[PDB]
Design a protein around this ligand. Structure first.
Ligand SMILES: *C/C=C(C)/C=C/C=C(C)/C=C/C1=C(C)CCCC1(C)C
Ligand SMILES: [Cl-]
Length: 208
């Protein structure tokens, strides 16, 4: 099982999700198409061997971080619509999200230990993002129908629990202490990407 095989698997999974969401679809459905559609492209590019950047003694996958930077704010946007956020609360959480994603991208691309300083900053901003999901956004979602509130809580917990695993996979993998091997590290992230995007989406379809 090679890296390319794992990338192709993620590509196929994202594509199936993309077509499923497009068929079922307006704002929510269009967002889900963007979430998995963008990831599909990133995985194909990586499957073709494009964007594998050598850094010191590790290999960094640049399309992964471009993907995350564009798709994770769309996931937060989806959750913000469910919770009924005003346009100002959106700005805070999307700003916090972007800090996490940019810090990870920069830390991965830096060869020296300064990269752990960048990782720490993303961790701090992530804790602030979790606070907004579990607190203010949950208060806000409470004002909606019982079924919408229930859907928000289920997507929120899926999101919080799984997103919290990524920093550990990153740190234990090549970008960090380089303990886990690239193949295992990639396999774990392909699984998480598929669940936090396509699984996320199908839980929404089921409730609709
Ligand atoms: C579809 C892709 C998803 C949901 C990716 C999620 C990624 C994260 C939650 C990553 C978080 C990170 C930290 C909290 C600290 C810095 C390193 C990251 C980017 C792995
Ligand atoms: Cl990476």
């Amino acid at each position: 099982v090679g890296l390319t095989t794992l990338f192709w698997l993620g590509a196929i999974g994202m594509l199936v999700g993309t077509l499923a969401f497009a068929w079922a679809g307006r704002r929510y459905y269009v967002t889900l198409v963007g979430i998995s559609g963008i990831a599909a492209v990133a995985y194909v590019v990586m499957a073709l061997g494009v964007g594998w950047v050598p850094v010191a003694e590790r290999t960094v996958f640049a399309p992964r971080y471009i993907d995350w930077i564009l798709t994770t704010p769309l996931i937060v946007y989806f959750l913000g619509l469910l919770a009924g956020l005003d346009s100002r609360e959106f700005g805070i959480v999307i700003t916090l999200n972007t800090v996490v994603m940019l810090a990870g991208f920069a830390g991965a691309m830096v060869p020296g230990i300064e990269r752990y300083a960048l990782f720490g900053m993303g961790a701090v901003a992530f804790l602030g993002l979790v606070y907004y999901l579990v607190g203010p956004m949950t208060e806000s979602a409470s004002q909606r129908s019982s079924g919408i509130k229930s859907l928000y809580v289920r997507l929120r917990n899926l999101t919080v629990i799984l997103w919290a695993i990524y920093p550990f996979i990153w740190l234990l993998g090549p970008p960090g202490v380089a303990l886990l091997t690239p193949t295992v590290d990639v396999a774990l992230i392909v699984y998480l990407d598929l669940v936090t995007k396509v699984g996320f989406g199908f839980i929404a379809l089921d409730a609709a």
